[PDB]
Amino acid sequence: MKLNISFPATGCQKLIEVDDERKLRTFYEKRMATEVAADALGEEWKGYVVRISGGNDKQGFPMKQGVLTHGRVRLLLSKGHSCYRPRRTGERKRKSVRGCIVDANLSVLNLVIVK
Amino acid sequence: GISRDNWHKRRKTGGKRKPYHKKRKYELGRPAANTKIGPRRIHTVRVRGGNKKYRALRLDVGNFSWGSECCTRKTRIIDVVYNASNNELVRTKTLVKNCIVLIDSTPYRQWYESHYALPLGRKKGAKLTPEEEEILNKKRSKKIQKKYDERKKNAKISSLLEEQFQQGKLLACIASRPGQCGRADGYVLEGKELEFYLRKIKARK
Amino acid sequence: ADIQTERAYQKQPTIFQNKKRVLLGETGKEKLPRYYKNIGLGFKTPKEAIEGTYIDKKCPFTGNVSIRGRILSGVVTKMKMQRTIVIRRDYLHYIRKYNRFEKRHKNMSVHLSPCFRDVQIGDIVTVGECRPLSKTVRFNVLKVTKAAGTK
Amino acid sequence: ARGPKKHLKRVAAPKHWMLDKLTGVFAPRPSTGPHKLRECLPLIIFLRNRLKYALTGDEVKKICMQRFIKIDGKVRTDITYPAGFMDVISIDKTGENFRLIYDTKGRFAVHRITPEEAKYKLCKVRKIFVGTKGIPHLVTHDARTIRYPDPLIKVNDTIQIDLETGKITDFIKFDTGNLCMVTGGANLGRIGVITNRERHPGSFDVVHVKDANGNSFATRLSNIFVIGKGNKPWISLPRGKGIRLTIAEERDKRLAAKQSSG
RNA sequence: UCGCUACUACCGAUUGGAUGGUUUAGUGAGGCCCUCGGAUCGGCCCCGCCGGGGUGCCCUGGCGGAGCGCUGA
RNA sequence: UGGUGACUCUAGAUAACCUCGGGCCGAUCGCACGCCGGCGGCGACGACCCAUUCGAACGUCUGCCCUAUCAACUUUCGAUGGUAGUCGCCGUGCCUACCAUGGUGACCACGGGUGACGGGGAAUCAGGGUUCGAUUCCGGAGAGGGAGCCUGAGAAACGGCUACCACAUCCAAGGAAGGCAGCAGGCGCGCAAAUU
RNA sequence: AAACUGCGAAUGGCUCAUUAAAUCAGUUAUGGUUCCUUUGGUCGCUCGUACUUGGAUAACUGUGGUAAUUCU
């Protein structure tokens, strides 16, 4: 597991690799874009709350906000969706996409320090 | 996925055609979106040339025409009483063209009492509220007191209409196609057409 | 009532038949004005088209069809439908090798208006081209002359 | 196909353009415009093939792109703009003026014309309709619509358009005794006086025409363009006067005209 | 009438297997249309910390929060 | 008012409607520069509607090879017609409800076949004929086999997408990507056909 | 340069498997329909912040995932 933590006011990202379980036990079974308390990550994470903005799974497939599935799902994506940009007008491709609920089957957790 | 081609049929002699192409796009047909009674909901379609079709799914008002008085007002559609294609379309309350509907007579009653100064559809007890006393018993000028009584001679109504005005519900017949224009217009049934469809509804039960 | 045999109301759609009248109109006469029109190629509108009570939306004298294209002819063979008959056209096809002809025939289903009443089979009839009226019908009967074995 | 064609093969071109067989597979394919593509001469054929000004289909681009070419007094930067009948081509850098009139053999012709005549053209009225709060219109064979026409203009007549303003100046009506040019068929490019007009209601009117030598011919009504009132043409005419010579005397003209040499 | 060598095709056990075309019945991917659904994204409010303008009250700027508020996507 | 051979046409008048998945009535760019704070000249993009052009579609009439060891077919499940509508760009059993019982057939329907895409044409030929026409022009169809769509003025599009059946490429085994009846080229097939 | 926007990619090319009143040819019809474009018309014809309105998003910067794709 890695965290791509980004602070929007100072505009600096950081990739922080975490290999534990107790540091990520607060993050499980949560959806995308919910404000959790990133406190159990370490000693310097006291007053920080952090929202889960996205993520990839172990095979590289990104997460999407609508799908409430614990695993991967095929979806037919058009223009204006995520995880897909068309090459032709009206071209709609079916791609596979990981759901929005956080698991241990992820590689990156995009995190936004909101406070 | 409907196709309204002519080549999926048999010939006049009865022989069946082996087809010479697959289904082309200009042969298409779309599903019947049957217009029901409810608060308005239209969904626009994109048809050939980029034009618009207003596929209405629920309709509640529509302007109708009292033909013999030259009066077009926007009423409220109540019911479906008889449909001369299929009668399962009456129990489903589907508005199609040429289906006989019940409308609300109140905009025509307000026009009649304003134009002829006669009480229409009132009961015999005649409880007349003062807000329409001023249009039924107004103060008239010198040239207007003869104009209203000049209108008052030919202000007769066929008695089949006044029984509908008693209960407040006129019979009307839709003359526009609601699944293609999104409106439910039409006309009020008068005279021989009225006493045809009346006995059709009466013999229906 | 001699018209309204259907389940909807048969009505000539251009004519308004609910005009308000006065006491000399209700006591005088119940007059239905009728819609007729002139087909423009020298076919006389029959007096039955101007005096009838029939209602037909594909009649070429009272309904909504316009006659345009080929004007043809044929003789009547089968009158067994509602408002439409079967005429057969007879022609000779030239075969080039033998320098001879051969008898040939083709049928047409064709719409017969109710103004042409008392039509027997076996008489010549002029037909006129219009839009498709049904799956097989594209001509409309224009004038009926009687077979020479009449009187 | 699915949707419209954008190419023209060469053998499938109009015969009167006189494109040879061996120069290419494709022919210039006229743009949509005022004229039918069978009834027009594109501007690339008038510059390269007829006038011999250009030599390739890139020099027509280099000529038209200097805005040196006005077709009916408006500058044309399309080389496949369909110029048709009675269209005035003004080239001002050289000083010439042409009008596209058919000649006696069914083609167009290089007809140089005086700039005093190039301020007007004739059109033929094709449909007259009212509308839009009761305002009457014309439609001519160039798709020129001229609202508020004279009430005595009807269908198949001839107006005279002023080309700087777009307005009608005076007209000719369809009658007998009027001088007409045939603009279609096998009598195309022929000039004669209207003798007779036979009516066929539900079909086409046939208009019998009489030459200036006595040669009568007929056409359908749509191939008839009234040029003059009486016998006087309101436009100039080509070197031949719209009078088709039979091939015997057309041979005699050559074998007697070579004998003026030395 | 009656003796040698081989091919063509059919019958040909084997209820030998594999695949098409018509239909009986059952099932029915995927798209579209309808009725729902509502993950999320705004906006308008309401107070709290407060400036200026006008005259305790109104409009403005920074935010913050909460509500099954009430609307849009 | 104007028209056609013929309108239920074109215009006119009156009463109303006008779709929140909205109908137009310009919050746009450039070049020369100005005339008495206003008034500007040429263009470029747009734009509802009308006309035209380029078409497309659906129809009318007439026409095609062999076969009777194919003589009756079509009609539950639309076959022929009538009425009312649904759908559709629109005309129509196109489709649905209720009816009527019709429609085609030795003048060869219906069924099967074709070493059948149709024409313009080609070979041969006294005159008549016979046979070929995959092939560069016109028209149709189709992109491995059926099917369904998105976008758009236009496609049921395959050098677009989504499935299924048939093949088949990579793979770290979780997945990913395909479509030469385009030009070359390869294999196979075959008597039989050229340069990556 | 890039990327957004517009337009095209529905033409051209290839082949002849289907298909026998079908395709197609000649002849007519749309008075029974759609038509990007071009050309001409029309575009103060409506009686009811403007000396200029609102929110995003690429390219870009920066941090990543996947063995792998014109993936994101």
UniProtKB/Swiss-Prot annotation, chain A:
Coiled-coil regions listed in the entry: none
Modified residues (ADP-ribosyl glutamic acid): 35
Modification after translation, per record: Ribosomal protein S6 is the major substrate of protein kinases in eukaryote ribosomes. The phosphorylation is stimulated by growth factors, tumor promoting agents, and mitogens. It is dephosphorylated at growth arrest.
UniProt cross-link Glycyl lysine isopeptide (Lys-Gly) (interchain with G-Cter in SUMO2), position: 14
Subcellular location: Cytoplasm; Nucleus, Nucleolus
Quaternary structure (record): Component of the small ribosomal subunit. Part of the small subunit (SSU) processome, composed of more than 70 proteins and the RNA chaperone small nucleolar RNA (snoRNA) U3.
Protein purpose: Component of the 40S small ribosomal subunit. Plays an important role in controlling cell growth and proliferation through the selective translation of particular classes of mRNA. Part of the small subunit (SSU) processome, first precursor of the small eukaryotic ribosomal subunit.
Family: Belongs to the eukaryotic ribosomal protein eS6 family.
Protein name listed in UniProt: Small ribosomal subunit protein eS6
Organism encoding this protein: Homo sapiens (Human)
First-to-last residue of the parent protein present: 1 to 115 of 249
From Swiss-Prot, chain B:
Ranges of biased composition (kind: Basic residues): 7-25
Broad class of where this protein is predominantly found: cytoplasm
N6-acetyllysine sites (modified residues): 36, 127
Sequence segments annotated as region (Disordered): 1-26
Subcellular location: Cytoplasm; Membrane; Nucleus, Nucleolus
GO molecular function: RNA binding; structural constituent of ribosome
Protein name (database record): Small ribosomal subunit protein eS8
Biological role: Component of the small ribosomal subunit. The ribosome is a large ribonucleoprotein complex responsible for the synthesis of proteins in the cell. Part of the small subunit (SSU) processome, first precursor of the small eukaryotic ribosomal subunit. During the assembly of the SSU processome in the nucleolus, many ribosome biogenesis factors, an RNA chaperone and ribosomal proteins associate with the nascent pre-rRNA and work in concert to generate RNA folding, modifications, rearrangements and cleavage as well as targeted degradation of pre-ribosomal RNA by the RNA exosome.
PTM annotation (Phosphothreonine): residues: 129
A GO term from the CC aspect: cytosol
Spans traversing the lipid bilayer: none
Lineage of source species: Eukaryota, Metazoa, Chordata, Craniata, Vertebrata
Signal peptide: none
Subunit structure: Component of the small ribosomal subunit. Identified in a IGF2BP1-dependent mRNP granule complex containing untranslated mRNAs. Part of the small subunit (SSU) processome, composed of more than 70 proteins and the RNA chaperone small nucleolar RNA (snoRNA) U3.
Family named by the database record: Belongs to the eukaryotic ribosomal protein eS8 family.
Membrane topology of this protein: Lipid-anchor
From Swiss-Prot, chain C:
GO CC term (a single one): cytosol
Family: Belongs to the universal ribosomal protein uS17 family.
Keywords: Acetylation, Citrullination, Cytoplasm, Lipoprotein, Methylation, Nucleus, Palmitate, Phosphoprotein, Ribonucleoprotein, Ribosomal protein, RNA-binding, rRNA-binding
Protein's name according to its UniProt entry: Small ribosomal subunit protein uS17
Coiled coil (residue ranges): none
Lipid-modified sites (S-palmitoyl cysteine): 59
PTM-bearing positions, type N-acetylalanine: 1
Lineage of origin: Eukaryota, Metazoa, Chordata, Craniata, Vertebrata
Modified residues (Phosphoserine): 66, 109
Annotated signal sequence range: none
Modified residues (Omega-N-methylarginine): 68
Gene this protein is translated from: RPS11
Subcellular location: Cytoplasm; Nucleus, Nucleolus
Matching Pfam families: Ribosomal_S17, Ribosomal_S17_N
Post-translational modification (record): Citrullinated by PADI4.
Function: Component of the small ribosomal subunit. The ribosome is a large ribonucleoprotein complex responsible for the synthesis of proteins in the cell. Part of the small subunit (SSU) processome, first precursor of the small eukaryotic ribosomal subunit. During the assembly of the SSU processome in the nucleolus, many ribosome biogenesis factors, an RNA chaperone and ribosomal proteins associate with the nascent pre-rRNA and work in concert to generate RNA folding, modifications, rearrangements and cleavage as well as targeted degradation of pre-ribosomal RNA by the RNA exosome.
Superkingdom classification of source: Eukaryota
Curated annotation (Swiss-Prot), chain D:
Covalent link (Glycyl lysine isopeptide (Lys-Gly) (interchain with G-Cter in SUMO2)) residue numbers: 229
Broad class of the protein's primary localization: cytoplasm
SMART domains the UniProt entry points to: S4
Entry keyword annotation includes Ribonucleoprotein: yes
Modified residues (N6-acetyllysine): 232
MF GO annotations: RNA binding; rRNA binding; structural constituent of ribosome
GO CC list: cytoplasmic ribonucleoprotein granule; cytosol; cytosolic ribosome; cytosolic small ribosomal subunit; extracellular exosome; focal adhesion; membrane; nucleolus
BP term (GO), one: cytoplasmic translation
Record domain S4 RNA-binding: where: 41-103
Keyword Nucleus: yes
Gene3D superfamilies, per the entry: 2.30.30.30, 2.40.50.740, RNA-binding S4 domain (3.10.290.10)
Keywords: Acetylation, Cytoplasm, Isopeptide bond, Nucleus, Ribonucleoprotein, Ribosomal protein, RNA-binding, rRNA-binding, Ubl conjugation
Function of the molecule: Component of the small ribosomal subunit. The ribosome is a large ribonucleoprotein complex responsible for the synthesis of proteins in the cell. Part of the small subunit (SSU) processome, first precursor of the small eukaryotic ribosomal subunit. During the assembly of the SSU processome in the nucleolus, many ribosome biogenesis factors, an RNA chaperone and ribosomal proteins associate with the nascent pre-rRNA and work in concert to generate RNA folding, modifications, rearrangements and cleavage as well as targeted degradation of pre-ribosomal RNA by the RNA exosome.
PANTHER family listed in its UniProt record: 30S/40S RIBOSOMAL PROTEIN S4 (PTHR11581), SMALL RIBOSOMAL SUBUNIT PROTEIN ES4 (PTHR11581:SF0)
Assigned protein family: Belongs to the eukaryotic ribosomal protein eS4 family.
Protein name according to UniProt: Small ribosomal subunit protein eS4, X isoform
The organism of origin for this protein: Homo sapiens
